[model samples]
Target: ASNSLEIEELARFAVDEHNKKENALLEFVRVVKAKEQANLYLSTPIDTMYYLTLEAKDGGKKKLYEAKVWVKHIMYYPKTANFKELQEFKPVG
Candidate 1:
């Protein structure tokens, strides 16, 4: 159950017995609702092709990820990621 830009993914599994266990660094984070005073804008952008997802956190508006992320070179700004607002909306029955 995730909305408002589907941001909330954390998978943690740890087991260590004298350094005999491994399972860490499975990133895919998002918890920035956009609001720090001084003009706000969270995240929005897409073109279908999102792979490499890892953004510990950037600066000012925090948008970091120096590894992998491919959504048709989606660069968020003014929410540019064409989806036609979820492909034209109209539901009321």
Candidate 2:
């Protein structure tokens, strides 16, 4: 089981990835729960689902974007502490 701190870290990671592409600023992110950790020991990977809020500004209208963020593991190598993953953002209306 992943701890609360781990969850928060992963959530922030997701938010960062989301902001990188959309030009939107992330207001905040909340950890829903750990979906699953494919592997947790010795160079294993982990996955988590999160909820995040962001500001989408266009022309002068600033809208709040609430969405579910899913972080999927890409690579996890404990031997060298190298890790990467993809964050999926699905906005809700």
Candidate 3:
């Protein structure tokens, strides 16, 4: 099992940001899939990233969107979106 809660929140972040940027009303329904990659080079600061497949509702239409987001973790703040940025967000269905 994975942290389903975290993935949902992350997907929510991606959609909300997209909505804010383009002035679209996208409601987050659920997350289809999510994968995280962590990198440790020096101080174990954690380079956290996620590739998410999200299910959303927009104007009565259900859509699937693939979003790649980088979450900069301060480490101390767990589950807090200290730095969340969306790199890619597009409709897949």
Candidate 4:
């Protein structure tokens, strides 16, 4: 599944969200392996559970650390439009 933009958008948001809470200024490179996509009916988070290895570069660490970033998908609502909630971030392997 070669979907464009959305993945990167979520990835970048994850990185930003992590940075707000954590550190090292992780620059989001990409998402290598993405897990199953879920769409829940009558739910707030309606369309994702992106569990996978995240590719990032740390300017301070001066290296590339393959980490994990999970992106949460929000339901389509008039109140909530185009949003993401990141659960996990920056676990190097």
Candidate 5:
């Protein structure tokens, strides 16, 4: 079984890392960078995961961004532990 404590710790890490980008625009840029890095498993959640939702507006443009950063531990495959970040954006009405 996966360690519950480890899972929690990793979750906090992922969220904090995302939040470090105080500027909304910077945060979005970081998400793109993280995607290119591919060192972390930032993506969506099928089960248990952590996510951040933000709204961005510049001039007449507005969008809603959903940041999904996952952190999970596998029981059988210890190496399968995942810690990644991803994001989605939609036009704001």
Candidate 6:
């Protein structure tokens, strides 16, 4: 029979794996960064501006620069936006 590890140990392992992308896990840093930029409050009729803040790293994963771009004039009506309307906007890749 195999003995299971403690919950704390599992959580710690999960965090470690997330930091190391070899395991294909998403890091909390990225999630936090995305959340910080998602301007849900800007969903107005005049303009639906989403502040996209992203960090670019070097080949060594070193911090290069952090950027903030505004994607304005989007659909503020509902979650179900048409393909044509959605296609009008571009993400900061």
What TM-score fits each model? 0.18, 0.49, 0.81, 0.63, 0.28, 0.26
Candidate of highest lDDT: 3
lDDT, candidate 5, 15-52, per-residue tens: 34544554233222122112211122454222344443
Write the residue-wise lDDT of candidate 1 on 1-93 in tens digits. Answer: 112343222111100110122222323344322211111235432233222223332223324332211123225565534331111111111
lDDT of 4 by residue, 35-72 (tens): 64666676445555666567777654433333344444
> How would the candidate models be sorted by lDDT, starting from the highest?
3, 4, 2, 5, 6, 1
Over all chains combined, what TM-score does candidate 6 have? Answer: 0.26
- 1 or 4, greater by lDDT: 4
lDDT of 2 by residue, 47-89 (tens): 4455554444433454454545555555534342424453556
**What CA RMSD would you report for each candidate?**
17.1, 5.5, 3.5, 4.0, 10.7, 14.2
lDDT of 6 by residue, 3-52 (tens): 13222232233344334543333322231132122234544433232222
TM-score, structure 5 vs. true:
0.28
Clashing pairs in 5: 41-84, 42-84, 42-85
**Regions of candidate 4 where Cα sits further than 4 Å from its true position:** 42-45, 60-80
Off by over 4 Å in 6: 1-43, 48-54, 76-93
Candidate 1 overall Cα lDDT vs. reference?
0.25
Flag the better candidate by lDDT, 3 or 6. 3
Poorest lDDT segment (10 consecutive residues) of candidate 3:
73-82
Ranking by TM-score: 3, 4, 2, 5, 6, 1
